[PDB]
From a paper:
Members of the GCN5-related N-acetyltransferase (GNAT) family are found in all domains of life and are involved in processes ranging from protein synthesis and gene expression to detoxification and virulence. Despite their sequence and structural diversity, all acetyltransferases function by transferring an acetyl group from the cosubstrate acetyl-coenzyme A (Ac-CoA) to the amino group of a specific substrate; the substrates can be very diverse across the enzymes, ranging from small metabolites such as amino acids to secondary metabolites such as antibiotics. Interestingly, a representative of such guanidine riboswitch-associated GNATs, a GNAT from Lactobacillus curia (LcGNAT), performs acetyl­ation of the arginine antimetabolite canavanine (or δ-oxa-arginine) but not of arginine itself. Hence, it has been suggested that LcGNAT serves a similar biological purpose as CtdAs, namely prevention of the misincorporation of canavanine into the bacterial proteome, as acetylation makes canavanine unusable for protein synthesis by the ribosome.
The crystal form obtained in this study contains two molecular copies in the asymmetric unit, which are essentially identical (r.m.s.d. of 0.73 Å for all 174 Cα atoms). Thus, we conclude that LcGNAT is likely to be monomeric in its biologically relevant state. The LcGNAT fold approximates, but does not exactly follow, the canonical topology of the GNAT enzyme family: β0–β1–α1–α2–β2–β3–β4–α3–β5–α4–β6. Instead, LcGNAT consists of seven β-strands and four α-helices with composition β1–α1–α2–β2–β3–β4–α3–β5–α4–β6–β7, therefore lacking an N-terminal β0 strand and including a C-terminal β7 strand. The sequence of the P-loop is highly conserved in GNATs, hosting a consensus motif (R/Q-X-X-G-X-A/G; Favrot et al., 2016; Burckhardt & Escalante-Semerena, 2020). Interestingly, the P-loop of LcGNAT is degenerated, as is also often the case in polyamine acetyltransferases. Here, we mutated Tyr97 in LcGNAT to the similarly sized, but catalytically inert, phenylalanine. The Y97F LcGNAT variant also showed a significantly decreased catalytic activity.
Author numbering: -2 to 171
The structure:
């Protein structure tokens, strides 16, 4: 096609099947390098169940976004505010809970566009900081967030099957 620009969309319940599919695909791709598929499966079978993501799609303090590259789905983003945050960071905070780019679109600026939009949304929502959890072994993501001015401010355990994983908490104030 002739569409070089990326386009953003807010997901609705008719995107559920597509959301489930990309959520699983990108999660496995991210964690399979250093986690067993058996452990990834147990995380997926609870977090990305269709009924589970349906309720999250109905949470008005959360929002899912799809990003398209020449009319093909290239990644997705989930943000939380208020009581939808996975940690109680308070009324002035804005969580990026999920931010993923499909493999075939990596290294083409899709992730930077998603995060740039996430920060725009936080500003419009009058929030004072953006925060997120990043696996301590996902050094590429760490460097990605660091170029946006995120800084490690703590940690948080992340259970994947029977294996305890450790997320960094990274924060960008503004």
């Amino acid at each position: 096609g002739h569409m070089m620009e990326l386009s953003i969309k807010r997901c609705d319940i008719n995107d559920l099947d597509q959301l489930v599919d990309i959520a699983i695909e990108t999660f496995v791709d991210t964690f399979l390098p250093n986690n067993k598929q058996k452990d990834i499966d147990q995380y997926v079978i609870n977090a990305f169940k269709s009924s589970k993501l349906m309720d999250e799609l109905h949470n008005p303090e959360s929002q899912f976004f799809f990003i398209y590259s020449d009319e093909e789905l290239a990644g997705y983003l989930k943000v939380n505010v208020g009581t939808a945050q996975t940690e109680d960071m308070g009324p002035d905070s804005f969580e990026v809970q999920r931010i993923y780019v499909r493999q075939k679109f990596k290294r083409t600026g899709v992730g930077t566009e998603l995060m740039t939009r996430a920060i725009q949304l936080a500003k419009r929502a009058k929030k004072k900081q953006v925060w997120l959890g990043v696996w301590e072994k996902n050094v590429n993501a760490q460097k990605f967030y660091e170029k946006f001015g995120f800084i490690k401010t703590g940690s948080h355990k992340f259970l994947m099957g029977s294996t305890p994983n450790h997320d960094w908490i990274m924060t960008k104030q503004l």
